[PDB]
Each structure stands twice: as C-alpha cells, then as structure tokens.
C-alpha cells in the first residue's frame, strides 16, 4: 500500500509519454518514497494526490505499477465498470 | 498569430551600452583576436 504524493509527469508536453505515467508514492509500511507506473494517462486521471494505492511489481528505475486505487481496480475504472469511492 | 521567423533586432540604449562595455572590457586587457602574420 502507498500514498500518492505527486504526479511528476502531469506537466510533460508529449502525451502518453513514459514520464507522464509515473507517480511518486510513499510506502506506508516504512515511509520510503518510490516511483510507480500507471497503465496510461487516461488512468492517470483517476489517480490524484492523497489516495491509498496498491502497488505491484513491474524509464529505467521504476519497478512498481499501480493495480488498485481507493480499494478499486484501475482496470475496472479504465473499463468503466466501477466508480472510485472517495 | 504565430510568427515564422526571428524578428529584426532593435538597437536600444541598453544594447549599445552592453556592446560598448564589451568592447571596453576586451580592450582593457588587450584581448584582440586579430590575424597574425606568418
């Protein structure tokens, strides 16, 4: 589990860039800060600051990918089958 | 409206001041890049 601190590539001009899909997350277990991937910028809309995100193993140096946000699967959100509870 | 090419520069007083300060700096130490006879 992790806390979304900031979306580093939110401002990058080239759409769907590798940088655009990275989110800076703080691991709750130990508080260390790590970087995680999002499947696409379309999914990056769902992720916003200060949500609990479930990370899984996967620009080199990024070894994690987000699988759930706020207890709901991103793929479920991306396929318009669920709503993110807030 | 977008521009296609660089605008023609204008010689304002600040530009002349910077240029003449440049020349004075160069000449103070006699830093001249001039052709030398072989």
């Amino acid at each position: 589990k992790g806390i979304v601190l900031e979306k580093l590539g939110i401002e990058s001009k080239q759409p769907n860039s590798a940088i655009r899909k990275c989110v800076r997350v703080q691991l709750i277990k130990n508080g260390k800060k790590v970087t995680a991937f999002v499947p696409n910028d379309g999914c990056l809309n769902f992720v916003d600051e200060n949500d609990e995100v479930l990370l899984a193993g996967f620009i080199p140096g990024v070894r994690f990918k987000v699988v759930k946000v706020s207890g709901v699967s991103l793929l479920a959100l991306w396929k318009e089958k669920k709503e993110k509870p807030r | 409206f977008d521009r296609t090419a660089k605008p023609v520069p204008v010689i304002t007083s600040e530009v002349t001041e910077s240029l003449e300060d440049m020349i004075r700096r160069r000449i103070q130490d006699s830093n001249f890049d001039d052709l030398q006879r072989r």
Binding site: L8, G9, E11, S12, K13, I19, C22, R24, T35, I59, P60, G61, V62 | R3, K6, P7, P9, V10
Partner: peptide, 29 residues
C-alpha cells in the same frame, strides 16, 4: 514590437520547461 516580446517570452517558457523536465527525470532514476 509584439513579435519580439513573444519570441523572448516563448524562449523563457521553453528554457524553464526543459530545465524543469531535467530535474524531474533526474529525481526518478
């Protein structure tokens, strides 16, 4: 006059973005 201002303005926007991209990519890796 406006043409010179835009090119000068766009120059700073591009320079900051490239520098501000560079810092972000450095931090991630």
């Amino acid at each position: 006059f406006e043409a010179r201002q835009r090119i000068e303005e766009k120059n700073k926007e591009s320079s900051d973005y490239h520098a501000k991209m560079a810092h972000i990519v450095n931090t991630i890796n």
